[PDB]
Amino acid sequence: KRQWALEDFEIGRPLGKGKFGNVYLAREKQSKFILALKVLFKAQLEKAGVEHQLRREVEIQSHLRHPNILRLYGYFHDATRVYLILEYAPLGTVYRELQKLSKFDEQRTATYITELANALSYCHSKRVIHRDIKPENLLLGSAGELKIADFGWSVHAPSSRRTTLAGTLDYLPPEMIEGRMHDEKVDLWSLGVLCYEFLVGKPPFEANTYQETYKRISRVEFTFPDFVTEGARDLISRLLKHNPSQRPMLREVLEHPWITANSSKPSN
Ligand SMILES: Nc1ncnc2c1ncn2[C@@H]1O[C@H](COP(=O)(O)OP(=O)(O)O)[C@@H](O)[C@H]1O
Ligand SMILES: Oc1ccc(Sc2ccc(O)cc2)cc1
Ligand SMILES: [Cl-]
Ligand SMILES: [Cl-]
Ligand SMILES: [Cl-]
Ligand SMILES: [Mg+2]
Ligand SMILES: [Mg+2]
C-alpha cells in the first residue's frame, strides 16, 4: 500500500471550507484519478486539542462501505499539514441546494430522508454514532444521491462528551447540549430537525442567541406553518421527543406512510 505525499497530486479549485478543513479538488498524477483533498493545519489542531477527533474521523470513516456514505481512501502529512483523501462529490452540498430553492417539496424531502436513514441504519449496526448531521455535511453524488460526510464528531455508543462545542446548537438533542450521557438516538433527533428544515426552510429551534436556542431545544418548543401536511407533522413529532427512548427505530422511519408515499427511492 502507498505511501502518499503532496507531490503525488495536482491541486485545483477550492471545494469548500470548514472550521479546520480546507478542501480542494485534486488529480492523482500517475492514474489521473479525480478526488478531494481535505487539508488541516497541525498548529490549529494542536492549539484546539482535537487530534483525537481527527484520528476517529480517519479510523471510523475509512472502514465504512455504503452507497450513501462518502468514502475516505487514506491520509498523509508533512511538517505543517495533515491531508485526508476523500471521494469527490460532484453535485455539492445539500446546504447549497437549500439556499438555492429556499424549501424542498415533499418528494425531494422524503427521498433524502430515506437515503439518510439507510446510511444511518448501517452506521448504527456497527454502534457508530455520527453526532453532526446537518446540511453542510451532506454531499451529493453524480446522480443526485445523498452521501453523509464529515465524521469528525463520530464515536462509539454509549458516550459522554469531552470536547467543547464550537458552533451551532441547532441540530443537537437536549441530552447533548446539557452534557449528559447519550447514544444512537441522538442521530434520530437530528434527522427530525433536518426533515423540518427541508420542508420549512429553517430549523425548528432557531433563534437570535445561544441562550434562547438552548431554551427552545431543552423545552422542545417548535410549531408548524400551515402548509406542512399531517403526514410530515406526525413523523417530525415522533422524532423530536425529549426522552430519547421514545424516538422511533430507523426501520419505523423507513416504513412511515408519509415516507413510503413520497420517496422515490426504496429502503436497505
Ligand atoms: N468530498 C467532497 N466533495 C465535494 N465537496 C466537499 C467534499 N468534502 C468537503 N466538501 C466541501 O467542503 C466543506 C467542508 O468539509 P468538511 O469535511 O465538512 O470539513 P469540516 O470538518 O471543517 O467541517 C463541505 O461542507 C463541502 O462544502
Ligand atoms: O495530530 C494528528 C496528525 C495526523 C493524524 S492522521 C492519523 C493518525 C493516526 C490514525 O490512527 C489515523 C490517522 C492524526 C492526528
Ligand atoms: Cl457545483
Ligand atoms: Cl457540534
Ligand atoms: Cl417530548
Ligand atoms: Mg463539516
Ligand atoms: Mg470536522
mmCIF file of C-alpha atoms and ligand atoms in Angstrom:
data_model
loop_
_atom_site.group_PDB
_atom_site.id
_atom_site.type_symbol
_atom_site.label_atom_id
_atom_site.label_comp_id
_atom_site.label_asym_id
_atom_site.label_seq_id
_atom_site.Cartn_x
_atom_site.Cartn_y
_atom_site.Cartn_z
ATOM 1 C CA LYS A 1 0.000 0.000 0.000
ATOM 2 C CA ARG A 2 1.046 3.608 -0.762
ATOM 3 C CA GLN A 3 2.842 5.843 0.757
ATOM 4 C CA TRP A 4 1.092 9.059 -0.401
ATOM 5 C CA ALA A 5 2.687 12.530 -0.475
ATOM 6 C CA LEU A 6 1.739 16.032 -1.648
ATOM 7 C CA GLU A 7 3.998 15.684 -4.710
ATOM 8 C CA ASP A 8 1.681 12.918 -5.974
ATOM 9 C CA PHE A 9 -1.214 15.355 -6.645
ATOM 10 C CA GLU A 10 -2.142 18.321 -8.836
ATOM 11 C CA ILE A 11 -4.338 20.690 -6.777
ATOM 12 C CA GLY A 12 -7.299 22.560 -8.258
ATOM 13 C CA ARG A 13 -10.313 24.595 -7.307
ATOM 14 C CA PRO A 14 -11.358 25.121 -3.675
ATOM 15 C CA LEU A 15 -14.449 22.988 -2.907
ATOM 16 C CA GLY A 16 -15.229 24.465 0.473
ATOM 17 C CA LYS A 17 -14.095 25.463 3.930
ATOM 18 C CA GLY A 18 -14.894 24.338 7.449
ATOM 19 C CA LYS A 19 -13.544 25.346 10.857
ATOM 20 C CA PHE A 20 -10.432 23.189 10.299
ATOM 21 C CA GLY A 21 -10.811 21.707 6.830
ATOM 22 C CA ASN A 22 -9.777 23.417 3.633
ATOM 23 C CA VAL A 23 -10.972 21.160 0.842
ATOM 24 C CA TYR A 24 -9.674 21.164 -2.757
ATOM 25 C CA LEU A 25 -10.326 19.301 -5.981
ATOM 26 C CA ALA A 26 -7.221 17.247 -6.877
ATOM 27 C CA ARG A 27 -5.917 14.818 -9.516
ATOM 28 C CA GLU A 28 -3.502 11.975 -8.683
ATOM 29 C CA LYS A 29 -0.640 12.227 -11.175
ATOM 30 C CA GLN A 30 0.081 8.671 -12.384
ATOM 31 C CA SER A 31 -3.550 7.464 -12.612
ATOM 32 C CA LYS A 32 -5.363 10.784 -13.350
ATOM 33 C CA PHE A 33 -7.850 9.843 -10.598
ATOM 34 C CA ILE A 34 -10.031 12.809 -9.506
ATOM 35 C CA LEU A 35 -10.642 13.167 -5.765
ATOM 36 C CA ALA A 36 -10.972 15.725 -2.961
ATOM 37 C CA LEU A 37 -8.081 16.575 -0.620
ATOM 38 C CA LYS A 38 -9.139 17.783 2.849
ATOM 39 C CA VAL A 39 -6.280 19.828 4.327
ATOM 40 C CA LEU A 40 -5.838 20.528 8.072
ATOM 41 C CA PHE A 41 -3.133 22.617 9.795
ATOM 42 C CA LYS A 42 -1.200 20.863 12.572
ATOM 43 C CA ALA A 43 -0.810 24.094 14.559
ATOM 44 C CA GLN A 44 -4.575 24.692 14.638
ATOM 45 C CA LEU A 45 -5.232 21.042 15.562
ATOM 46 C CA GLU A 46 -2.737 21.181 18.452
ATOM 47 C CA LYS A 47 -3.897 24.543 19.812
ATOM 48 C CA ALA A 48 -7.525 23.281 19.816
ATOM 49 C CA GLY A 49 -6.508 19.894 21.213
ATOM 50 C CA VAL A 50 -8.584 17.926 18.690
ATOM 51 C CA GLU A 51 -6.028 15.388 17.445
ATOM 52 C CA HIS A 52 -8.134 12.503 18.818
ATOM 53 C CA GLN A 53 -11.170 13.678 16.764
ATOM 54 C CA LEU A 54 -9.186 13.525 13.515
ATOM 55 C CA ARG A 55 -7.932 10.002 14.327
ATOM 56 C CA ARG A 56 -11.546 8.898 14.907
ATOM 57 C CA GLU A 57 -12.638 10.520 11.655
ATOM 58 C CA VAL A 58 -9.989 8.527 9.733
ATOM 59 C CA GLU A 59 -10.306 5.189 11.515
ATOM 60 C CA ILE A 60 -14.121 5.123 11.511
ATOM 61 C CA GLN A 61 -14.929 6.534 8.040
ATOM 62 C CA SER A 62 -12.214 4.512 6.238
ATOM 63 C CA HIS A 63 -13.814 1.215 7.284
ATOM 64 C CA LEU A 64 -17.432 2.140 6.374
ATOM 65 C CA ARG A 65 -18.735 0.924 2.988
ATOM 66 C CA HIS A 66 -22.207 2.118 1.921
ATOM 67 C CA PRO A 67 -23.502 3.944 -1.216
ATOM 68 C CA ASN A 68 -24.925 6.758 0.893
ATOM 69 C CA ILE A 69 -21.703 7.312 2.900
ATOM 70 C CA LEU A 70 -18.706 9.277 1.497
ATOM 71 C CA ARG A 71 -15.540 7.151 1.107
ATOM 72 C CA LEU A 72 -12.283 8.012 2.832
ATOM 73 C CA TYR A 73 -9.409 6.386 0.908
ATOM 74 C CA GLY A 74 -6.416 7.239 3.100
ATOM 75 C CA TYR A 75 -4.266 10.028 4.559
ATOM 76 C CA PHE A 76 -0.780 11.568 4.858
ATOM 77 C CA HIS A 77 1.054 14.512 6.470
ATOM 78 C CA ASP A 78 4.111 16.796 6.479
ATOM 79 C CA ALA A 79 5.697 19.315 8.851
ATOM 80 C CA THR A 80 2.737 21.699 8.841
ATOM 81 C CA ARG A 81 -0.326 19.866 7.485
ATOM 82 C CA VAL A 82 -2.472 16.716 7.518
ATOM 83 C CA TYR A 83 -4.208 15.533 4.279
ATOM 84 C CA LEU A 84 -7.315 13.289 4.035
ATOM 85 C CA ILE A 85 -8.015 11.659 0.646
ATOM 86 C CA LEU A 86 -11.781 11.655 0.027
ATOM 87 C CA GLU A 87 -14.262 10.604 -2.608
ATOM 88 C CA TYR A 88 -15.195 13.693 -4.702
ATOM 89 C CA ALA A 89 -18.937 14.582 -4.583
ATOM 90 C CA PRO A 90 -19.594 16.447 -7.811
ATOM 91 C CA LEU A 91 -23.032 17.956 -7.075
ATOM 92 C CA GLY A 92 -22.079 19.846 -3.919
ATOM 93 C CA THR A 93 -23.855 20.210 -0.576
ATOM 94 C CA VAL A 94 -27.482 19.871 0.451
ATOM 95 C CA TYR A 95 -26.838 23.239 2.193
ATOM 96 C CA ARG A 96 -26.200 24.975 -1.156
ATOM 97 C CA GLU A 97 -29.250 23.350 -2.751
ATOM 98 C CA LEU A 98 -31.472 24.552 0.118
ATOM 99 C CA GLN A 99 -30.073 28.088 -0.291
ATOM 100 C CA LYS A 100 -30.947 27.940 -3.997
ATOM 101 C CA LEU A 101 -34.527 26.648 -3.635
ATOM 102 C CA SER A 102 -35.477 28.018 -0.151
ATOM 103 C CA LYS A 103 -37.609 24.910 0.592
ATOM 104 C CA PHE A 104 -37.815 21.314 -0.723
ATOM 105 C CA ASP A 105 -41.096 19.717 -1.845
ATOM 106 C CA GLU A 106 -42.360 16.551 -0.171
ATOM 107 C CA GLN A 107 -40.890 14.171 -2.767
ATOM 108 C CA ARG A 108 -37.347 15.585 -2.568
ATOM 109 C CA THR A 109 -37.561 15.657 1.241
ATOM 110 C CA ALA A 110 -38.869 12.098 1.667
ATOM 111 C CA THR A 111 -36.222 10.807 -0.770
ATOM 112 C CA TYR A 112 -33.335 12.475 1.148
ATOM 113 C CA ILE A 113 -34.715 11.189 4.477
ATOM 114 C CA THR A 114 -34.829 7.637 3.071
ATOM 115 C CA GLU A 115 -31.188 7.840 1.921
ATOM 116 C CA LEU A 116 -30.118 9.361 5.256
ATOM 117 C CA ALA A 117 -31.939 6.627 7.225
ATOM 118 C CA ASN A 118 -30.388 3.890 5.089
ATOM 119 C CA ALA A 119 -26.906 5.312 5.780
ATOM 120 C CA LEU A 120 -27.574 5.735 9.495
ATOM 121 C CA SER A 121 -29.010 2.209 9.758
ATOM 122 C CA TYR A 122 -25.664 0.880 8.515
ATOM 123 C CA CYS A 123 -23.667 3.101 10.937
ATOM 124 C CA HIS A 124 -25.732 2.070 13.953
ATOM 125 C CA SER A 125 -25.347 -1.621 13.093
ATOM 126 C CA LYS A 126 -21.677 -1.029 13.957
ATOM 127 C CA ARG A 127 -22.646 1.053 17.021
ATOM 128 C CA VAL A 128 -21.218 4.129 15.298
ATOM 129 C CA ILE A 129 -22.899 7.459 16.109
ATOM 130 C CA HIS A 130 -22.350 10.386 13.708
ATOM 131 C CA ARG A 131 -23.465 13.306 16.006
ATOM 132 C CA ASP A 132 -23.008 16.091 13.404
ATOM 133 C CA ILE A 133 -25.672 15.540 10.738
ATOM 134 C CA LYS A 134 -26.569 18.893 9.171
ATOM 135 C CA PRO A 135 -26.908 20.240 5.611
ATOM 136 C CA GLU A 136 -23.285 21.366 5.114
ATOM 137 C CA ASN A 137 -22.098 17.792 5.877
ATOM 138 C CA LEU A 138 -24.457 16.094 3.419
ATOM 139 C CA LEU A 139 -22.935 15.839 -0.081
ATOM 140 C CA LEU A 140 -24.422 14.847 -3.466
ATOM 141 C CA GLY A 141 -23.190 12.244 -5.955
ATOM 142 C CA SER A 142 -23.244 12.330 -9.746
ATOM 143 C CA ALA A 143 -26.834 11.063 -9.748
ATOM 144 C CA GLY A 144 -28.045 13.461 -7.081
ATOM 145 C CA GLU A 145 -27.891 10.824 -4.329
ATOM 146 C CA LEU A 146 -27.160 11.909 -0.746
ATOM 147 C CA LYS A 147 -23.897 10.908 0.945
ATOM 148 C CA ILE A 148 -23.176 11.523 4.642
ATOM 149 C CA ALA A 149 -19.757 13.065 5.265
ATOM 150 C CA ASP A 150 -17.545 14.781 7.905
ATOM 151 C CA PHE A 151 -17.028 12.094 10.578
ATOM 152 C CA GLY A 152 -15.015 14.377 12.864
ATOM 153 C CA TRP A 153 -17.529 14.155 15.734
ATOM 154 C CA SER A 154 -18.389 10.452 15.281
ATOM 155 C CA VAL A 155 -17.928 7.891 18.089
ATOM 156 C CA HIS A 156 -18.981 4.561 19.578
ATOM 157 C CA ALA A 157 -22.085 4.432 21.819
ATOM 158 C CA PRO A 158 -22.635 4.975 24.646
ATOM 159 C CA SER A 159 -20.767 8.241 25.141
ATOM 160 C CA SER A 160 -20.112 11.304 27.206
ATOM 161 C CA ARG A 161 -18.655 14.411 25.596
ATOM 162 C CA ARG A 162 -15.075 15.519 26.263
ATOM 163 C CA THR A 163 -14.705 18.297 23.687
ATOM 164 C CA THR A 164 -16.004 21.892 23.625
ATOM 165 C CA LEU A 165 -18.962 22.733 21.355
ATOM 166 C CA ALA A 166 -17.832 25.494 18.992
ATOM 167 C CA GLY A 167 -20.685 26.308 16.640
ATOM 168 C CA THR A 168 -24.431 25.968 16.221
ATOM 169 C CA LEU A 169 -26.623 24.150 18.718
ATOM 170 C CA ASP A 170 -29.342 23.856 16.073
ATOM 171 C CA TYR A 171 -29.129 20.105 15.333
ATOM 172 C CA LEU A 172 -28.229 18.780 18.816
ATOM 173 C CA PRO A 173 -30.672 16.983 21.178
ATOM 174 C CA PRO A 174 -31.401 18.023 24.783
ATOM 175 C CA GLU A 175 -29.135 15.297 26.251
ATOM 176 C CA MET A 176 -26.144 16.604 24.222
ATOM 177 C CA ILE A 177 -26.480 20.332 24.925
ATOM 178 C CA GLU A 178 -26.995 19.505 28.609
ATOM 179 C CA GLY A 179 -23.770 17.486 28.571
ATOM 180 C CA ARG A 180 -25.346 14.203 29.620
ATOM 181 C CA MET A 181 -24.766 10.587 28.592
ATOM 182 C CA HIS A 182 -26.053 9.837 25.064
ATOM 183 C CA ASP A 183 -26.418 7.070 22.451
ATOM 184 C CA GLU A 184 -27.505 6.371 18.851
ATOM 185 C CA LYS A 185 -30.818 8.120 19.499
ATOM 186 C CA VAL A 186 -29.002 11.470 19.046
ATOM 187 C CA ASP A 187 -28.939 10.884 15.261
ATOM 188 C CA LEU A 188 -32.711 10.268 15.237
ATOM 189 C CA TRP A 189 -33.334 13.698 16.815
ATOM 190 C CA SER A 190 -31.067 15.306 14.208
ATOM 191 C CA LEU A 191 -33.000 13.504 11.444
ATOM 192 C CA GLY A 192 -36.179 15.175 12.768
ATOM 193 C CA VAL A 193 -34.509 18.603 12.739
ATOM 194 C CA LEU A 194 -33.430 18.016 9.113
ATOM 195 C CA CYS A 195 -36.887 16.890 7.955
ATOM 196 C CA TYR A 196 -38.391 20.090 9.380
ATOM 197 C CA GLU A 197 -35.644 22.299 7.876
ATOM 198 C CA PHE A 198 -36.022 20.689 4.423
ATOM 199 C CA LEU A 199 -39.779 21.403 4.352
ATOM 200 C CA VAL A 200 -39.872 24.819 6.050
ATOM 201 C CA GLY A 201 -36.542 26.438 5.114
ATOM 202 C CA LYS A 202 -35.137 26.874 8.617
ATOM 203 C CA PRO A 203 -34.541 24.612 11.613
ATOM 204 C CA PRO A 204 -37.305 24.364 14.257
ATOM 205 C CA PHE A 205 -35.445 25.772 17.325
ATOM 206 C CA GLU A 206 -33.567 28.575 15.583
ATOM 207 C CA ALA A 207 -33.089 31.809 17.470
ATOM 208 C CA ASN A 208 -31.036 35.024 17.762
ATOM 209 C CA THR A 209 -28.918 33.897 20.712
ATOM 210 C CA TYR A 210 -27.224 30.798 22.112
ATOM 211 C CA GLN A 211 -29.048 31.213 25.381
ATOM 212 C CA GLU A 212 -32.514 31.225 23.865
ATOM 213 C CA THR A 213 -31.715 28.460 21.342
ATOM 214 C CA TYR A 214 -30.656 26.333 24.328
ATOM 215 C CA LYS A 215 -34.006 27.114 25.948
ATOM 216 C CA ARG A 216 -36.045 26.225 22.843
ATOM 217 C CA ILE A 217 -34.215 22.896 22.439
ATOM 218 C CA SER A 218 -34.341 21.754 26.073
ATOM 219 C CA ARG A 219 -38.054 22.608 26.278
ATOM 220 C CA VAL A 220 -38.696 21.236 22.762
ATOM 221 C CA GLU A 221 -40.506 24.398 21.653
ATOM 222 C CA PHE A 222 -41.462 24.146 17.961
ATOM 223 C CA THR A 223 -44.542 24.903 15.844
ATOM 224 C CA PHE A 224 -45.583 24.236 12.207
ATOM 225 C CA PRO A 225 -46.550 26.654 9.430
ATOM 226 C CA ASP A 226 -49.941 25.889 7.867
ATOM 227 C CA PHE A 227 -48.512 24.301 4.720
ATOM 228 C CA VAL A 228 -46.792 21.374 6.499
ATOM 229 C CA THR A 229 -49.034 18.317 5.898
ATOM 230 C CA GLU A 230 -50.465 15.935 8.512
ATOM 231 C CA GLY A 231 -48.096 13.129 7.498
ATOM 232 C CA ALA A 232 -44.972 15.244 7.799
ATOM 233 C CA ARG A 233 -46.166 16.566 11.186
ATOM 234 C CA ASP A 234 -46.656 13.027 12.519
ATOM 235 C CA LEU A 235 -43.135 11.914 11.556
ATOM 236 C CA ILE A 236 -41.398 15.095 12.776
ATOM 237 C CA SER A 237 -43.255 14.988 16.110
ATOM 238 C CA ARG A 238 -42.197 11.345 16.694
ATOM 239 C CA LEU A 239 -38.518 12.163 16.067
ATOM 240 C CA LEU A 240 -38.396 15.342 18.203
ATOM 241 C CA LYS A 241 -39.112 13.734 21.595
ATOM 242 C CA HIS A 242 -37.287 14.920 24.735
ATOM 243 C CA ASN A 243 -36.964 11.335 26.016
ATOM 244 C CA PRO A 244 -34.567 9.512 23.650
ATOM 245 C CA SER A 245 -36.024 6.032 24.231
ATOM 246 C CA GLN A 246 -39.342 7.277 22.810
ATOM 247 C CA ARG A 247 -37.775 8.191 19.469
ATOM 248 C CA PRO A 248 -38.515 5.602 16.768
ATOM 249 C CA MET A 249 -36.213 2.938 15.343
ATOM 250 C CA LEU A 250 -34.858 3.710 11.872
ATOM 251 C CA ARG A 251 -36.959 0.836 10.455
ATOM 252 C CA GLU A 252 -40.043 2.744 11.656
ATOM 253 C CA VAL A 253 -38.908 5.868 9.784
ATOM 254 C CA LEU A 254 -38.244 3.952 6.549
ATOM 255 C CA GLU A 255 -41.711 2.364 6.759
ATOM 256 C CA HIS A 256 -43.634 5.533 7.784
ATOM 257 C CA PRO A 257 -46.653 6.002 5.485
ATOM 258 C CA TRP A 258 -45.626 9.571 4.543
ATOM 259 C CA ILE A 259 -42.142 8.367 3.594
ATOM 260 C CA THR A 260 -43.350 5.396 1.553
ATOM 261 C CA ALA A 261 -45.960 7.552 -0.186
ATOM 262 C CA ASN A 262 -43.498 10.270 -1.245
ATOM 263 C CA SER A 263 -39.972 8.828 -1.516
ATOM 264 C CA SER A 264 -38.645 7.906 -4.958
ATOM 265 C CA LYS A 265 -36.026 5.528 -3.550
ATOM 266 C CA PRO A 266 -36.545 2.225 -1.714
ATOM 267 C CA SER A 267 -35.470 1.017 1.696
ATOM 268 C CA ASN A 268 -31.874 -1.158 2.920
HETATM 269 N N1 LIG B 1 -15.561 15.094 -0.831
HETATM 270 C C1 LIG B 1 -16.034 16.337 -1.104
HETATM 271 N N2 LIG B 1 -16.516 16.669 -2.330
HETATM 272 C C2 LIG B 1 -17.001 17.898 -2.571
HETATM 273 N N3 LIG B 1 -17.054 18.899 -1.669
HETATM 274 C C3 LIG B 1 -16.603 18.689 -0.393
HETATM 275 C C4 LIG B 1 -16.068 17.363 -0.044
HETATM 276 N N4 LIG B 1 -15.705 17.400 1.264
HETATM 277 C C5 LIG B 1 -15.988 18.644 1.704
HETATM 278 N N5 LIG B 1 -16.518 19.414 0.728
HETATM 279 C C6 LIG B 1 -16.902 20.830 0.938
HETATM 280 O O1 LIG B 1 -16.045 21.339 1.966
HETATM 281 C C7 LIG B 1 -16.788 21.670 3.158
HETATM 282 C C8 LIG B 1 -16.001 21.335 4.432
HETATM 283 O O2 LIG B 1 -15.712 19.933 4.524
HETATM 284 P P1 LIG B 1 -15.830 19.119 5.940
HETATM 285 O O3 LIG B 1 -15.248 17.737 5.684
HETATM 286 O O4 LIG B 1 -17.268 19.214 6.402
HETATM 287 O O5 LIG B 1 -14.848 19.985 6.891
HETATM 288 P P2 LIG B 1 -15.015 20.469 8.448
HETATM 289 O O6 LIG B 1 -14.568 19.253 9.214
HETATM 290 O O7 LIG B 1 -14.042 21.598 8.596
HETATM 291 O O8 LIG B 1 -16.456 20.868 8.610
HETATM 292 C C9 LIG B 1 -18.092 20.903 2.992
HETATM 293 O O9 LIG B 1 -19.175 21.493 3.740
HETATM 294 C C10 LIG B 1 -18.304 20.957 1.498
HETATM 295 O O10 LIG B 1 -18.731 22.278 1.148
HETATM 296 O O1 LIG B 2 -2.404 15.355 15.077
HETATM 297 C C1 LIG B 2 -2.666 14.409 14.104
HETATM 298 C C2 LIG B 2 -1.971 14.427 12.904
HETATM 299 C C3 LIG B 2 -2.234 13.485 11.928
HETATM 300 C C4 LIG B 2 -3.183 12.497 12.146
HETATM 301 S S1 LIG B 2 -3.532 11.292 10.878
HETATM 302 C C5 LIG B 2 -3.906 9.771 11.720
HETATM 303 C C6 LIG B 2 -3.131 9.324 12.782
HETATM 304 C C7 LIG B 2 -3.425 8.130 13.413
HETATM 305 C C8 LIG B 2 -4.501 7.361 12.991
HETATM 306 O O2 LIG B 2 -4.814 6.165 13.620
HETATM 307 C C9 LIG B 2 -5.273 7.803 11.926
HETATM 308 C C10 LIG B 2 -4.969 8.991 11.290
HETATM 309 C C11 LIG B 2 -3.882 12.482 13.342
HETATM 310 C C12 LIG B 2 -3.626 13.432 14.314
HETATM 311 CL CL CL B 3 -21.382 22.521 -8.065
HETATM 312 CL CL CL B 4 -21.259 20.369 17.250
HETATM 313 CL CL CL B 5 -41.293 15.241 24.232
HETATM 314 MG MG MG B 6 -18.216 19.854 8.047
HETATM 315 MG MG MG B 7 -14.713 18.346 11.056
#
